């Protein structure tokens, strides 16, 4: 969303060949793993290191305190807060 459609800022991972997945290394609890996301937030796929491959759709509103993720078709609505370094999520009966 922050890229505003500027091709060089959009995190598409575009390539002439096979596109690069947007890659995040994330620590939560006692699990540190990569998440690799391909596609676009309307229709994406996410794969997790030591984990499975899932269908993803992500509904982000600028300045909203709520964010929605449809994961393998299960839509969950999370409260989100973010610092320079941590993402706090709450939804589906969990907070982390």
């Amino acid at each position: 969303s922050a890229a505003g459609g500027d091709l060089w800022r959009v995190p598409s991972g575009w390539r002439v060949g096979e596109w690069a997945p947007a890659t995040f290394r994330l620590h939560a609890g006692d699990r540190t793993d990569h998440v690799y996301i391909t596609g676009n937030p309307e229709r994406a796929s996410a794969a997790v290191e030591h984990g499975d491959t899932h269908t993803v759709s992500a509904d982000f509103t600028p300045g909203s305190d709520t964010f929605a993720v449809t994961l393998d078709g299960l839509r969950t609505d999370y409260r989100v807060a973010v610092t320079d370094s941590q993402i706090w999520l709450s939804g589906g009966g969990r907070t982390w």
Partner: peptide
């Protein structure tokens, strides 16, 4: 940068 295009 994360997710940057690359024009090879």
């Amino acid at each position: 940068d994360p997710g940057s295009p690359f024009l090879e």
